[PDB]
Ligand binder design. Structure first.
Ligand SMILES: Nc1ncnc2c1ncn2[C@@H]1O[C@H](COP(=O)(O)OP(=O)(O)OP(=O)(O)O)[C@@H](O)[C@H]1O
Lengths: 370, 743
RNA sequence: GAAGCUGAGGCCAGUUUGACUGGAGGUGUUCGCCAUCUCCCUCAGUAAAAACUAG
DNA sequence: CAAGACCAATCTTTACACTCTGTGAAGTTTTT
DNA sequence: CAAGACCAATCTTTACACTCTGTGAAGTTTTT
DNA sequence: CAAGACCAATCTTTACACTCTGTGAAGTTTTT
RNA sequence: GAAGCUGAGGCCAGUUUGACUGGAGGUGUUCGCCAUCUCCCUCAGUAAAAACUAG
């Protein structure tokens, strides 16, 4: 039974109180104004952040909780989904012998809003929420989408960091996930996707993934709804590939099993932090030099205790970083225990690093009481 | 081993399911409609497509996926050892080498090959079948010889015991043909014919002529290998048709026939798989259907006897014991007897798999802990404990009174959902070695205890003291040892005050029967809120205290009135003259207590008396009711004292967690104890046999209360709300269990 | 036209009479900074979703 | 630069009339 | 006087030779 | 210029040995 | 580099003071000589396979 939303569904469990005034006075639900959205710059990328006090944030959150979480997705989408994780994206490819990796350029900016409307239409009943002026689907997309002030030409845009944007991206790209999965299956290729990074693997002894034909076919498919392939990040290798530090290897031939292991570049930062901890480097220097976390003087809440405040903050930040990396490798260990696909010697190295991390966190906590 | 893993993606009821770490016996348990046989169908289709049979592809779980994948990881370490060695130069060995392990050792170099040879050999063969949306099937290995050889080496034997043809056991022979491997080049059809003709002829040559005639007339196809071995078996043995204990099959039963069929087949499997390198995977559905519990237990016992008779270890060795790996035996059962005997007789060689279909519809496979380190628990393991594996929600309790309460038929009538939860009283050691927290996700549970197990207040010292269970619980709850910040600051604060409670002191009143300002209700609520993460619920007082609260005083009193009116009779075969004599000797007003002692006594049987006798008895009973009402409301200052006295008489605890026996031993509250003893020995003597915990007063109380309140109120929602108001403690636990069951 | 790229500066080293480029080595390699072994500072600004808290 | 291949769900598919028959004139990591 | 109907179990029923084909030249009650 | 996808048929695939168990020390038209 | 193209000449017309290009029109059209209606000569050289001899 698919999820259906009617007028009562929006008015009772979705809106609750965010748009009570609009529904009692029959006033049109307004666009997300620029006053509610702040524009952050990170790299060349631009992020859009909504203010929490606005009712749009709350209705986005309850939309995410109750509506977008029930629409079926494609199993090739491993990101932003309940139970999906990067290791799951990198696992089906342990069976492959040749690997290829593609990227979609500006995935979130290139999502057409009309495609979002078409994708969400079957799951929302066609009614008139506000008299005969605004339809229910129109109000919901008014809640979900946004108009970019920097680029007014392209009109309504699903922005980065709008709470509901990832789930909507998965839903609107389910069509292409199905198309590309069908094509790869007919070619005998294992396909998976994380956000916009696509990974293909051939378990047979063939050069299909290294050919220009495969790129051309994937691009031809992606042009159906207007996406493009980032040519700078295209990668194709044999018997071993490294994706953001996680190395998948398969030296075997017929019926062989590969292994996934993080490399030393990935563990460089944690190894350096443990080395600095063993060298009795002060905590402030460790936090600033490696963890790029610093206590700006404008962030200090009170002037009553400041010398103690800085030390406690840096102690807590080091504890939090060590615990975070401890849980990141525990995730690796759990994934290996569930699937048995991580390198055994790398499992030994993980165990050693985890014991070192635990001992260092114990030492820091013991020093906290001194 | 035989099979390393089996993975199903988007086929039938499975979304993404991986089964691994197989043991010699794999018991599959789970509710109806969870996919237990869907595993059978998936494996059967995979093996049918392995031999290039023409079958319909299986249906996709959801149509939003363009693929459906089945992955099998065969374990070819032993076959690699078999074939790689230089001694085995046979033609079957040469074929296995040239098909499987060639082109795989080809890619490796000398260093890696030598490393594989010298070190602990571990070789796997992964085969993936992908069904596209247009019913096409694509393999990950494009050599059909490889797939046929894999089917031959690791045959799949499959039985649904429900649809067994009882009166014809022919399908046994076929399966036997799948098991054993040997040579047939030397045996032609000429030497055998000459041998038979020489043995069967009054004149030499006749039988050969007969066989030549039959061969010339007919037109046939050369034998396959399995037909060859079947024919040689059937000629060699004394008889073909099967007989159960000297009696023909059609005269015997159905359960006996199925039991004997399964027993002989499994015995043949284990006996014949000893000498060969062919490692079958056998799947039995319902090994228990139509079997008496004793027969199912005996079936598993005989299976284990055969399994252990051929098993070789460091201590057991000699003639007749083999190191050859046993076939992977899966069987899906719904019988606690099969599972109980499997666990008790196999130990570490068995695995229990739980199949549950979640909320969306996908199947989940989990491993339930079935290995115990305690020999005493293994020996004492019985049907009651093994029943827990089939539970949906286990409510562990401490004493038999909770069992009496939570199993009440009338109480379960108004809460049907809680009828699906099995209540099992668990000692601390039993609860420790069961390990219910290991499953949790598979079988949700809750452990119900009294707050006395945590804190032991001392009246003399006016101090709380922490039991070691509290320290152990705090130790698991101080998660922050190696963690990062989260919204757990409230938890850290609560643990800080839980440690602080030791140093604090609280005064008591009425010689240690109440708290001046401390609210044990607040402490219980905080403890339960904190410890919900550990699935433990602590009640403020004992279960008797939970039943008998200040709010439950009226109905309980009504019960006393009813227990005053109906269930006693006259202690004499002559009610008229006896009642007259006791009315004469004992006054109505001044000596009502001895008069009621002499006249009325508790009796299940109620003889019918004369109308005047009924009138006299009714007047006496009403007078005694009024006298007890006045005496109870006079001797006790407030309702709370009466409730505490009732709790203590039945065996409960005070606010300070003290029983009547504990108070008597410590000597405190002499006045209250004397009042209770006076009420028990003088006015409430008839209730004295019902004062004990095991006397069953809980059942009668709950039955009467439910019947009375249903008489007062008709609607079921109204009756449930009245139950919640009148017993705020028990109804809360039932509601929580039902809510957890629904999800 | 289409494609792609990175926060703002300050000493020190290398290329420049006056400003621009990097701040472990070894080994192998598909040459990708890709893999494996051993051993610079400051100041801004830092949205969202999911996985993960060994046993 | 530009293009074939653009999810899977979603709603009475069984006769009419003049014509008895014819239909029409405060964590890590990843995407980023 | 004399008479039809006189349990159900209990044991290799599959070919031979000369003839390649033919078979042969110290309780009650019941029976009592 | 250069490249994934390079027919379908065609041959005993069932055990070995020391080890009773372990695997090893003179027409038209089309292509043209 | 890869791709593609057609037998050798002689008057006459069109482009050229002196040699090169075509030898029914109408209509429509994907503009392909593609479709539909109506009504230049000479001389060489010309392998193979299949279909087809209305009814
Ligand atoms: N073709 C199919 N497509 C989708 N789901 C299917 C299909 N066939 C069966 N199912 C699902 O799989 C389950 C079928 O029950 P199944 O026999 O697999 O379970 P089971 O535990 O063996 O049952 P039982 O306990 O009665 O033996 C149901 O949940 C059903 O919805």
């Amino acid at each position: 039974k698919m999820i259906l939303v009617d007028k009562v569904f929006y008015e009772k469990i979705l809106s609750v109180e965010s748009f009570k005034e609009n529904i009692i006075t029959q006033s049109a639900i307004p666009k997300i104004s620029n006053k509610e959205v702040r524009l952050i710059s990170s790299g060349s990328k631009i992020f859009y952040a909504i203010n929490n006090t606005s009712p749009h944030s709350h209705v986005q959150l309850r939309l995410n909780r109750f509506f977008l979480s029930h629409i079926p997705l494609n199993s090739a989408a491993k990101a932003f989904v309940r139970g999906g994780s990067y290791l799951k994206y990198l696992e089906p490819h342990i069976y492959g012998s040749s690997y290829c990796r593609l990227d979609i350029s500006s995935f979130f900016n290139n999502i057409s809003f009309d495609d979002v409307k078409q994708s969400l239409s079957p799951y929302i009943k066609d009614e008139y929420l506000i008299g005969t002026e605004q339809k229910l689907i129109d109000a919901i997309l008014n809640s979900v989408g946004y108009e970019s002030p920097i680029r007014k030409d392209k009109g309504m845009i699903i922005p980065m960091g709008f709470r509901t944007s990832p789930a909507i991206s998965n839903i609107v790209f389910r069509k292409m996930d199905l198309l590309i999965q069908d094509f790869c299956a007919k070619k005998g290729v294992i396909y998976s996707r994380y956000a916009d990074d696509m990974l293909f693997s051939n378990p047979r002894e063939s050069k299909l993934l290294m050919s220009d034909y495969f790129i051309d076919e994937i691009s031809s498919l992606l042009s159906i709804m207007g996406f493009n392939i980032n040519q700078s990040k295209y990668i194709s290798r044999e018997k071993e590939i490294s994706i953001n530090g996680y190395v998948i290897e398969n030296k075997g031939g017929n019926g062989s099993i590969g292994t996934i292991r993080l490399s030393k570049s990935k563990l460089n930062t944690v190894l350096k932090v443990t080395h600095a901890l063993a060298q009795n480097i002060p905590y402030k220097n460790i936090c600033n030099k490696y963890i790029k976390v610093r206590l700006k003087e404008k962030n200090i809440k009170y002037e009553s205790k400041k010398d103690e405040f800085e030390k406690k903050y840096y102690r807590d930040q080091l504890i939090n970083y060590l615990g975070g990396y401890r849980s990141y490798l525990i995730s690796l260990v759990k994934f290996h225990s569930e699937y048995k696909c991580v390198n055994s010697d790398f499992i030994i190295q993980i165990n050693g690093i985890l014991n070192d991390i635990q001992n260092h966190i114990q030492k820091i906590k013991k020093n906290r009481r001194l | 081993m035989t099979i390393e893993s089996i993975r199903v993606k988007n086929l039938l009821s499975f979304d993404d399911v991986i089964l691994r770490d197989f043991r010699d016996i794999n018991c599959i348990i789970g509710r109806n409609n969870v996919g237990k046989s869907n595993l059978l169908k998936v494996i059967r289709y995979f093996y049918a497509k392995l031999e290039n049979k023409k079958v319909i592809p299986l249906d996709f779980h959801t149509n939003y996926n363009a693929v459906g994948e089945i992955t099998f990881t065969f374990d070819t370490t032993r076959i690699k050892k078999i074939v790689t060695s230089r001694k085995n130069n046979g033609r079957f060995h040469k074929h296995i080498y040239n098909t499987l392990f060639k082109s795989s050792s080809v890619k490796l170099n000398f260093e890696e090959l030598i490393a594989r040879k010298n070190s602990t050999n571990k070789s796997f063969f992964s085969l993936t079948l992908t069904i596209c949306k247009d019913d096409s099937v694509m393999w990950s290995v494009d050599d059909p010889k490889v797939r046929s050889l894999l089917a031959t080496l690791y045959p799949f034997l499959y039985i649904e015991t429900r649809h067994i043809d009882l009166y014809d056991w022919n399908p046994i022979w076929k399966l036997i043909s799948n098991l054993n491997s040997f040579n047939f080049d030397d045996v032609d059809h000429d030497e055998l014919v000459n041998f038979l003709d020489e043995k069967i002829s009054s004149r030499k040559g006749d039988y050969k002529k007969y066989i030549d005639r039959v061969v010339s007339v007919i037109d046939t196809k050369p034998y396959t290998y399995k037909e060859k071995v079947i024919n040689y078996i059937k000629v060699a043995i004394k008889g073909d048709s099967f007989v159960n204990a000297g009696e023909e099959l059609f005269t015997q039963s159905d359960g006996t026939n199925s039991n004997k069929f399964l027993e002989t087949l499994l015995h043949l499997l284990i006996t014949l798989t000893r000498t060969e390198f062919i490692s079958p995977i056998v799947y039995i559905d319902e090994p228990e259907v139509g079997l008496h519990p004793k027969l199912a237990e005996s079936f598993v016992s005989n299976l284990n006897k055969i399994y252990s008779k051929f098993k070789k270890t460091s201590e057991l060795s000699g003639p007749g014991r083999y190191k050859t790996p046993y076939p992977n035996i899966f069987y899906s059962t719904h019988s606690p007897s099969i599972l109980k005997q499997t666990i008790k007789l196999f130990g570490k060689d068995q695995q229990v798999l739980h199949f549950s279909k979640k909320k969306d519809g996908s199947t989940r496979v989990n491993k339930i802990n079935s290995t115990y380190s305690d020999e005493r628990f293994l020996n004492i393991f019985s049907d009651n404990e093994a029943r827990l594996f089939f539970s949906e929600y286990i409510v562990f309790v401490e004493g038999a009174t909770e069992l009496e309460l939570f199993r009440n038929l009338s109480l379960l009538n108004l809460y049907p959902a809680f009828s699906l939860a099995d209540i099992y009283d668990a000692n601390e050691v039993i609860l420790a070695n069961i390990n219910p927290g290991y499953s949790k996700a598979s079988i949700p549970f809750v452990i119900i205890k009294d707050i006395d197990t945590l804190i032991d207040y001392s009246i003399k010292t006016e101090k709380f003291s922490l039991r070691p269970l509290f320290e152990k619980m705090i130790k698991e709850l101080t998660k922050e040892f190696d963690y990062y910040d989260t919204g757990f600051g409230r938890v850290r604060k609560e643990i800080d005050l839980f440690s602080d409670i030791q140093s604090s002191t609280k005064k008591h009143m009425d010689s240690g029967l109440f708290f001046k300002r401390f609210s044990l209700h607040n402490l219980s609520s905080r403890i339960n809120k904190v410890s919900r993460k550990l699935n433990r619920y602590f009640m403020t007082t004992t279960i008797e205290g939970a039943l008998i609260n200040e709010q439950s005083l009226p109905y309980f009193f009504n019960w006393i009135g009813d227990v005053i009116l109906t269930q006693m009779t006259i202690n004499n075969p002559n009610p008229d003259k006896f009642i007259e004599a006791m009315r004469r000797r004992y006054n109505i007003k001044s000596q009502v207590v001895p008069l009621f002692k002499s006249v009325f006594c508790i009796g299940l049987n109620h003889p019918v008396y004369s109308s005047a006798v009924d009138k006299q008895a009714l007047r006496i009973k009403l007078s005694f009711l009024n006298y007890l009402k006045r005496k109870v409301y006079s001797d006790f200052n407030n309702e709370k004292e009466i409730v505490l006295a009732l709790r203590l008489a039945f065996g409960g605890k005070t606010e300070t967690q003290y029983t009547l026996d504990k108070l008597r031993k410590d000597g405190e509250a002499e006045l209250f104890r004397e009042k209770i003893k006076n009420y028990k020995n003088n006015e409430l003597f008839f209730l004295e046999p019902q004062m004990t915990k095991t006397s069953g007063w809980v059942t009668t109380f709950l039955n009467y209360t439910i019947e009375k309140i249903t008489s007062e109120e008709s609607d079921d929602d109204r009756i449930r709300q009245k139950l919640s108001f009148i017993f705020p403690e028990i109804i809360s636990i039932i509601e929580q269990a039902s809510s957890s069951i629904e999800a």
